[PDB]
Amino acid sequence: NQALLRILKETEFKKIKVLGSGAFGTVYKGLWIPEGEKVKIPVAIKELREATSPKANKEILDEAYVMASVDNPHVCRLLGICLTSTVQLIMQLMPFGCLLDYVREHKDNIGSQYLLNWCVQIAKGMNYLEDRRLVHRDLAARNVLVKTPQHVKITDFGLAKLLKVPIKWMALESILHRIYTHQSDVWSYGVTVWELMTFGSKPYDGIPASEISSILEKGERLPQPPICTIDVYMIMRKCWMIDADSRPKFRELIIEFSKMARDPQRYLVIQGDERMHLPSPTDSNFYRALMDEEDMVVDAD
Amino acid sequence: EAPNQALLRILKETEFKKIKVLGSGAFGTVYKGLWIPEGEKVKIPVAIKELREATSPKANKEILDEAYVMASVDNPHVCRLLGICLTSTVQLIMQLMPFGCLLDYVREHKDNIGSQYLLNWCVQIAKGMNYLEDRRLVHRDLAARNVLVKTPQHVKITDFGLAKLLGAEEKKVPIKWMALESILHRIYTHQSDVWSYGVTVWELMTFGSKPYDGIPASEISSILEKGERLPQPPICTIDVYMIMRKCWMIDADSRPKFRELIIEFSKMARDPQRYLVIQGDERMHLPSPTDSNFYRALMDEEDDVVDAD
Ligand SMILES: CN1CCN(c2ccc(Nc3ncc4nc(Nc5ccccc5)n(C5CCCCC5)c4n3)cc2)CC1
Ligand SMILES: CN1CCN(c2ccc(Nc3ncc4nc(Nc5ccccc5)n(C5CCCCC5)c4n3)cc2)CC1
């Protein structure tokens, strides 16, 4: 459905500051000016890194439409595109920024309930892509966005297809043969979950990328996170099985994490966890009106 | 109820900072403000209205019960009160709308506004008021100034319950928007809200013309008593003007009910050209599906519009 993607002229928006960057490109906080209107509306703009092996414009657009069609509460939807000399992608700007940064910032101060819920939400997002026969190919903590602390969405879907390689998040078959599948995504999902539990620790730190395929073949895997019970780590371990069909399906993951969300304290052992706050209804209603109006969580009991 | 307790957020002064004044009103002064959630680095833009001291005042608990009622409203076309800070000055916190009030917008865009927009705005405002009437609530101050634009396609009534909470001295009062019974005896009812709706529709059709310009506020009851009314706008057909005329009938029960208005204005929207005459109207048309989709994603994720047959 083309109605979903809006092509924009350069004049109708401006980049005002840099938010970050990736292997893919640079991201800017931008302002959209509706023509004939006096408002400026904040957006996030990614200007694509320039185009080694440039693809036909029609191909870019077809990929954009698919990108534009994503309709789930936990997957970011591509809103607009401006293509000139350069390709620029427009999406909603999220004040909280990315999940990897958010966990680092609140490093030991995050409650077990938030963490398990995030795992559920990402899995729900991934499940949606699988239903649609779509492979993200680059799931990572940096590519999850915080709409509100209680709501997160996967971003950057389609980009990897659109254009270094993230070896440390990759499935062994993908590293070896460039094979990408939902199951490979499952592998990345496990790594992403490992990032959350360790509060944004870098995976395989101190081990170079070239060594990584070799460590994996040996049977080495990321270590059990300090807050994680065996019940959680095992799911991660399963995600990293060599035989891909052996790895869990995204649907199963939603259930396991949801069950855990019901009794977070049993699953995650975090210092001061009792002290930590999981969001009140009054607080939740305030958050929704201000930031998160859209349709969309598991609580202890 | 518990549900009520949840809807209104008690705010500390530490929680928010006022940054800029968006305007001033009889009720108070309005600022674009930033909310900082505890333990967070983000600042969230919000609208804070800081209340002018009430005509003879009420206890905070009294203030609070009324605030719970305001936080209570849950309709697409009525602004809901998100939060309150009562520590010193009374401050009301609500969602910030970039487009601003509808009255300024029509004034700004008078050359560029289509029939489809105008009729739809009437449907939406009537819908919101009908919702308040169902809740057994009287706004008491309807005016174009008190309607906010979420997006050009979507509008919301604001400032509900302020009049009652604030009061007014007998000795700033929206006389020209008021029903005669309200002016003379200070009777306020849904039927009086209906009269205001008539004036608000007038404000829109004339594109922000002041009502009764050149007539003193003091003279207003008399001119009305004589059967004087606001003139028919050039754009408006007789069928529209008559509806406005019904709204200003002296007998309250004779006046239209909001549900009736919703239906009638809704019918009109289906054939917009028939009911209003605007030069270049075919150029001025509702946003296409692509623009509509974009707009909603950026600004309007909540919750229709009636389009031509
Ligand atoms: C020192 N900090 C740095 C982080 N920061 C911040 C960063 C991002 C946001 N919000 C936001 N919103 C939407 C985004 N969409 C993409 N990504 C993206 C991908 C494809 C198309 C459009 C955007 N991003 C990226 C996510 C990775 C890190 C850079 C911003 C986005 N980021 C709010 C605050 C505030 C200052
Ligand atoms: C020279 N002008 C200055 C004004 N301006 C502007 C002002 C407000 C907004 N948006 C916005 N949003 C929420 C509002 N909530 C109340 N009012 C309000 C009342 C009670 C509780 C909370 C808000 N307002 C009033 C609407 C009438 C004029 C003063 C701002 C609001 N207005 C957008 C643009 C554009 C440039």
UniProtKB/Swiss-Prot annotation, chain A:
One of its GO terms (biological process) is positive regulation of DNA replication. The chain holds residues 700 to 1014 of 1210 of the full protein. It is found in: Cell membrane; Endoplasmic reticulum membrane; Golgi apparatus membrane; Nucleus membrane. ATP binds at L19, G20, S21, G22, A23, F24, G25, T26, V27, K46, M91, Q92, D156. It is linked to Lung cancer: A common malignancy affecting tissues of the lung. The most common form of lung cancer is non-small cell lung cancer (NSCLC) that can be divided into 3 major histologic subtypes: squamous cell carcinoma, adenocarcinoma, and large cell lung cancer. NSCLC is often diagnosed at an advanced stage and has a poor prognosis. Neonatal nephrocutaneous inflammatory syndrome: An autosomal recessive disorder characterized by intrauterine growth retardation, premature birth, fragile skin, recurrent skin infections and sepsis, failure to thrive, nephrocalcinosis, and nephromegaly with tubular dysfunction. Some patients have chronic diarrhea, and necrotizing enterocolitis. The gene is EGFR. Residues 13-268 form the Protein kinase domain. Belongs to the protein kinase superfamily. Tyr protein kinase family. EGF receptor subfamily. Changing G20S: Found in a lung cancer sample; somatic mutation; strongly increased kinase activity; constitutively activated kinase with higher levels of basal autophosphorylation; more sensitive to gefitinib than wild-type. There is a cross-link at K17, K38, K55, K58, K218, K249, K259 (Glycyl lysine isopeptide (Lys-Gly) (interchain with G-Cter in ubiquitin)). One of its GO terms (molecular function) is MAP kinase kinase kinase activity. This is Epidermal growth factor receptor. It comes from Homo sapiens (Human). Binding of the ligand triggers homo- and/or heterodimerization of the receptor triggering its autophosphorylation. Heterodimer with ERBB2. Forms a complex with CCDC88A/GIV (via SH2-like regions) and GNAI3 which leads to enhanced EGFR signaling and triggering of cell migration; binding to CCDC88A requires autophosphorylation of the EGFR C-terminal region, and ligand stimulation is required for recruitment of GNAI3 to the complex. Interacts with ERRFI1; inhibits dimerization of the kinase domain and autophosphorylation. Part of a complex with ERBB2 and either PIK3C2A or PIK3C2B. Ubiquitously expressed. Isoform 2 is also expressed in ovarian cancers.
